[PDB]
């Protein structure tokens, strides 16, 4: 459905979110190892802080469009019976008198 | 217990 | 049919019913209701140790038997059969009750004899034999009306007319009378599938 | 009501009893006493289960509801209710019994399919009920529903008003056959029956089949001779479902001796009595 | 009502970056407690913010939420079969 | 009879959302109706001096007979074979029971909620005799045909005789049929009285749909001027 995909695509930018937390506790921790006194860990940390703001910039992105397509999804396709249970007993009285 | 509390409000009056 | 009083400076609960007459009153220290009769009247206990639904459901009851045996002595005609127990009601036996909730005559499958019927119970909760007999004047007087003519306009319902003139008495024989335009000729004649030659006789 | 739904996923409603009424069917023997159980309706057993699942208990309860509004009114016809889940109704031949029970209270039966008939039927007539609701909101009130008991009534009163029909067409084709076919040979009885808004128009008259009075018109095929040719057709009718109205039409062709009587008589004895008037005048010689 | 997503979504998403970028500067350079302090105030507002970028999300998914041939032969057999004609 | 109302006008674009609007607020579909409204002047060849027996002023008013019709002689030839509801809009002897009616001013007072305005209507069955056709009744009762304009559209019902009459008008000449809402819909929403508590209600329910649809459609009063049928 289209709240389906679209709610699983939300579901991607809070997964995008839980990266975002790897690349910090990568660029903290990391960045600590920088601190401690060695420089062979300064490609991966660059590497794993640019990796973070590009998903951050592709969080922002997808989420800004998502919230205009709730500005563009008002009126269309989103909200600003006792004739199924008749054909019930007619098809529950047909089944009776013809078992 | 306020119903028995109202009770004995009604009850001393 | 169901009023609740409570009463506060006094310490006392009132119920009343039979609204279509039973007094719960505390005047020693105790809660007692008491239960009127047809010249009768008994005691019932109350506090958990007495079920006011039962108590009040049966008192409905032992009364109702009695209401059922005022009719008896009241006013009961001998084609009228009635029984109390099971009000049996043979006029054809039809199954007679009362009801509990107002007090009105129930018949097992109702007819414009129980309209009539059951209207006279519907004002007044006996002069139900004087509307039995006017009801049993009323089917004889449909028949002779279908077989011959029937007029309503100067006689009363006591005795039918046919149209000289004619006329037709119950409660007395034929009579032959004739009307003014005020009674002026009267003479009696008595007489005895027989009631259609009796009319073809008639004319 | 309005269940709230939280977290698989589970609705709470206000577990729960599972509230299924049923319908059993009794029969008289040869006692003339009691009843035997003769019949008894089967009982069957995820969001959207739930969601059909509480419709059908808050549905069927609506319908015990209305069937308990409807017993205060059928007092006096016989249909008596006692227990405020479980409502009797008596016939001089036969007994339903009508309960709304759980599964924790309570085959070589026969009246099994007619329980279940019974209950669609109960069902569709309270659809029925509900097409009368919004039609009766739709155009006339420009507002409300106003309904009353005694008008909306119709369920049970109804449904009995068939089998009481069929055993007064009985005794009455009865006293025909013996005041008519019993005296006179060649002689038979034959009965013979009696916009954008266009959707809940079609609904409405299909039950008309299921809404309609049951009233039959009894045309009497006597044998006419070659200087004689009475007339005798009689109607048996309803005033509301129950009770019963016999209007005698008679049209005597007698030469020399022609008259019409068409009476109305609700008492069968009578219906012996004039038709015994009929038969033993114009009817022979 | 999505102006307020922009305005406050964009803002804690600044306060995100651009705190995170003054924490790594400040812990790279009673001083020192008042300093472990700080970055640690810093560290847990960028808690808050994530927390607060999900429950907006949260937010927008809760804004995401908010014929009668057969009726007459079928009710003719039901009722001769009913009353047993 | 006192009616309140409260007009607006919608485009053709937004028919469908105002239809779905009130089908989800009222709870109800709506139903396709028309009628056909013919007014009578008073006749220019006559002159009467307008004043009653009692020497009492009296002001000349138009006569406003409306009926019904069905839909089979309105829809054409381009037109068959289409579903019988609201998007049908889009696409666009003796007499007959008549229905005879005048309206008066509304009443005045400024910074009024509601439209109230004063309607007298009897209902013609039939007639009969040599001149039995209404014009000739209206020519015997001394009025003659003016205008006349047909009008086709939806209505609702909600609560508390509430009317919202989404439909469009059309004037009906021997040169042509044009259409006085060109470009919309004009929308209706009249409830009928016939006490002072009973007018403050009704009055309170139109402001109740007025402050429901704030946002959406603008329900204002129309002017006086706008409503009196008086022949000046």
């Given at each position: 459905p289209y709240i389906q995909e679209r709610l699983k695509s939300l579901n991607d930018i809070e997964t995008q979110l839980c990266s975002m937390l790897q690349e910090a506790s990568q660029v903290t921790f990391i960045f600590g190892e920088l601190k401690?006194?060695?420089?062979?860990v300064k490609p991966q940390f660059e590497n794993h802080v640019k990796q973070f703001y590009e998903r951050l910039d592709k969080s922002t992105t997808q989420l800004r469009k998502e919230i205009q397509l709730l500005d563009e999804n008002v009126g269309t396709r989103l909200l600003p019976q006792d004739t199924e249970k008749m054909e019930e007993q007619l098809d529950l009285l047909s089944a009776i008198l013809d078992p | 217990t306020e119903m028995l509390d109202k009770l004995m409000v009604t009850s001393i009056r | 049919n169901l009023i609740h009083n409570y009463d506060s400076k006094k310490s006392t609960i009132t119920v009343r019913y039979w609204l279509n007459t039973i007094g719960i009153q505390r005047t020693t220290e105790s809660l007692i209701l008491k239960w009127d009769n047809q010249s009768a009247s008994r005691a019932k206990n109350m506090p958990i140790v007495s079920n006011i639904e039962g108590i009040l459901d049966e008192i409905m009851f032992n009364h109702a038997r009695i209401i059922r045996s005022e009719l008896l002595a009241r006013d009961i005609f001998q084609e009228d059969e009635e029984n109390s127990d099971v009000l049996l009601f043979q006029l054809a036996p039809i199954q007679l009750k009362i009801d509990l909730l107002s007090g009105q005559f129930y018949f097992r499958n109702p007819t414009p004899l129980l309209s009539n019927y059951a209207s006279k119970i519907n004002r007044a909760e006996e002069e139900l034999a004087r509307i039995l007999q006017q009801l049993k004047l009323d089917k004889i007087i449909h028949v002779l009306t279908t077989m011959f003519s029937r007029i309503i306009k100067?006689?009363?319902?006591?005795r039918t007319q046919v149209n000289w003139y004619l006329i037709l008495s119950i409660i007395s024989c034929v009579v032959e009378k004739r009307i003014g335009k005020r009674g002026k000729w009267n003479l009696k004649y008595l007489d005895n599938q027989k009631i259609m030659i009796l009319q073809r006789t008639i004319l | 009501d309005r269940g709230i739904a939280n977290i698989n996923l589970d609705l709470i409603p206000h577990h729960s009893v599972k509230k299924f009424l049923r319908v059993r069917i009794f029969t008289k023997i040869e006692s003339e006493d009691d009843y035997i159980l003769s019949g008894e309706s089967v009982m069957d057993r995820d969001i959207r289960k739930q969601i059909q699942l509480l419709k059908k208990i808050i549905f069927e309860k609506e319908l015990m509801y209305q069937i308990k509004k409807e017993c205060a009114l059928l007092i006096s016809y016989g249909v008596s209710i006692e227990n405020e889940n479980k409502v009797i109704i008596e016939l001089p031949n036969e007994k339903f019994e009508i309960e709304l029970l759980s599964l924790d209270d309570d085959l070589p039966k026969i009246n099994d399919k007619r329980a279940n008939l019974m209950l669609v039927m109960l069902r569709l007539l309270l659809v029925v009920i509900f097409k009368k609701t919004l039609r009766s909101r739709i155009?006339?009130?420009?507002?409300l529903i106003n309904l009353n008991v005694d008008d909306d009534?119709?369920?049970i009163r109804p449904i009995l008003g068939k089998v009481r029909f069929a055993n007064y067409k009985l005794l009455l084709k009865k006293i025909i056959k013996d005041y008519v076919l019993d005296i006179v040979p060649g002689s038979s009885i034959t009965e013979t029956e009696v916009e954008n808004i266009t959707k809940l128009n079609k609904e409405i008259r299909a039950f008309d089949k299921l809404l309609n009075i049951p009233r039959r018109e009894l045309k009497i095929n006597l044998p006419l001779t070659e200087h004689k040719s009475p007339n005798l057709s009689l109607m048996l009718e309803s005033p509301n479902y129950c009770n019963a109205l016999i209007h005698i039409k008679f049209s005597a062709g007698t030469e020399a001796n022609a008259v019409s009587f068409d009476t109305t008589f609700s008492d069968f004895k009578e219906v012996e009595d004039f038709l015994h008037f009929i038969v033993a005048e114009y009817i022979q010689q | 009502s999505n102006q307020a997503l922009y305005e406050k979504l964009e803002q804690t998403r600044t306060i995100l970056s651009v705190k995170l970028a003054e924490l790594i500067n400040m812990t790279t350079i009673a001083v020192a407690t008042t300093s472990v302090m700080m970055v640690n105030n810093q560290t847990m507002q960028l808690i808050k913010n994530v927390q607060d970028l999900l429950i907006l999300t949260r937010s927008i998914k809760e804004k995401w939420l908010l014929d009668e041939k057969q009726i007459e032969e079928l009710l003719d057999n039901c009722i001769e079969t009913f009353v047993a004609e | 009879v006192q009616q309140l109302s409260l007009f607006g006008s919608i485009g053709d674009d937004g028919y469908d959302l105002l239809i779905s609007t009130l089908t989800t607020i009222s709870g109800n579909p709506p139903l396709l109706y028309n009628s056909l409204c013919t007014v009578w002047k008073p006749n220019p060849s006559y002159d009467v001096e307008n004043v009653n027996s009692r020497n009492q002023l009296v002001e000349p008013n138009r006569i406003k007979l409306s009926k019904e019709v069905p839909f089979s002689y309105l829809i054409?030839?381009?037109?068959?074979?289409?579903?019988?509801?609201?998007?049908?809009?889009?696409?666009f002897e003796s007499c007959s029971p008549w229905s005879l009616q005048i309206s008066d001013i509304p009443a005045a007072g400024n910074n009024r909620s509601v439209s109230m305005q004063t309607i007298a209507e009897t209902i013609i069955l039939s007639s009969a005799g040599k001149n039995s056709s209404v014009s000739s009744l209206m020519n015997g009762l001394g009025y003659v045909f003016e205008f006349q304009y047909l009008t086709i559209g939806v209505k609702f019902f909600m609560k508390h005789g509430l009317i919202l009459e989404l439909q469009k008008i059309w004037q009906i000449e021997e040169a042509g049929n044009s259409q006085i809402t060109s470009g919309g819909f004009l929308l209706k929403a009249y409830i009928n009285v016939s006490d002072i508590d009973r007018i403050n209600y009704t009055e309170t329910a139109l402001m109740n749909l007025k402050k429901e649809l704030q946002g959406y459609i603008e329900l204002s009063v129309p002017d006086r001027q706008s409503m009196d049928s008086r022949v000046a």
């Open positions: 401690r006194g060695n420089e062979s | - | 100067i006689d009363k319902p006591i | 155009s006339s009130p420009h507002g009534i119709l369920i | - | 054409d030839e381009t037109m068959m074979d289409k579903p019988l509801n609201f998007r049908i809009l889009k696409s």
